[PDB]
Each structure stands twice: as structure tokens, then as C-alpha cells.
Amino acid sequence: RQREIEMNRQQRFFRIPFIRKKKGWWYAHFDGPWIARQMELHPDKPPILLVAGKDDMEMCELNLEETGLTRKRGAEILPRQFEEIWERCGGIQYLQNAIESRQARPTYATAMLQS
Amino acid sequence: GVTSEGKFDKFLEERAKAADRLPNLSS
Structure with a gap:
């Protein structure tokens, strides 16, 4: 359910450039203190989309506070600024497939797709 | 403590390398 998650865990969204010109960008959605989705956009490359569970080894392991x-x-951005790019890159189908295959850890983002 | 932010830096540097295996859109 979306509200119970919402009403207990703040959803926070961030974007920062990668270190060495055009920069690549690292995007993250934190479901409370722990990362739920990660998205990496490099110049002239396909996007890298990452969801908790399936892609844990490639995702930030730190608590948000750390x-x-x-x-x-x-660094902090609006939910919609993350969402628009996530959706444009095929993130809905990506997460949905991960849910279908039982590879996705339940998060606010999966609750969003339970609709 | 800012060892943890150092850790975040190292993490970003390895992620930044994770794309060099990806094909270019241009070719």
C-alpha cells in the first residue's frame, strides 16, 4: 500500500554528476534511509536502471544519512524530476519485470506499481 | 565521521566506470 509507506517513510530524490566536458549523472530514490531505485545516465550511452533486490550489488549500500x-x-530534487526521467528510460517496465520475476525487494516504488 | 562520505565517493567512482562497457548511441 502506498500511503502507509508514505506516511512513515519520507521519499527523497537526488541527482549528482559523476567525476571525470559533458558529465554523466547519478540519480537516486531513497525510500526512507535506504535506496530503492538508482539510475545512471552517461553521455552517448544507454541508461543504466537499477532496482533494490535485483541490482543490490550495483547500488548504494549506505544509509542516506551517511x-x-x-x-x-x-543535490536534492523533486519527486517528479526523478520520475519523468525514470519513466522516459523505461523504468516502469523495468521494475514491473523485476516484480514479475520475483527479483525486486518491496519498496515504495513497487507499491507505486501495485496499482 | 566523514569516512562514510569518502566511501560514497569511491562508490561513485566505480559506478562511473560501470558504463565503459556500454555501447555508444552514436556507434
């Missing part, structure tokens, strides 16, 4: 993301001015 990352320093909340203390980097300009």
Missing part, C-alpha cells in the same frame, strides 16, 4: 547527499547543496 552519504552526505543531504548536505550537498543542490
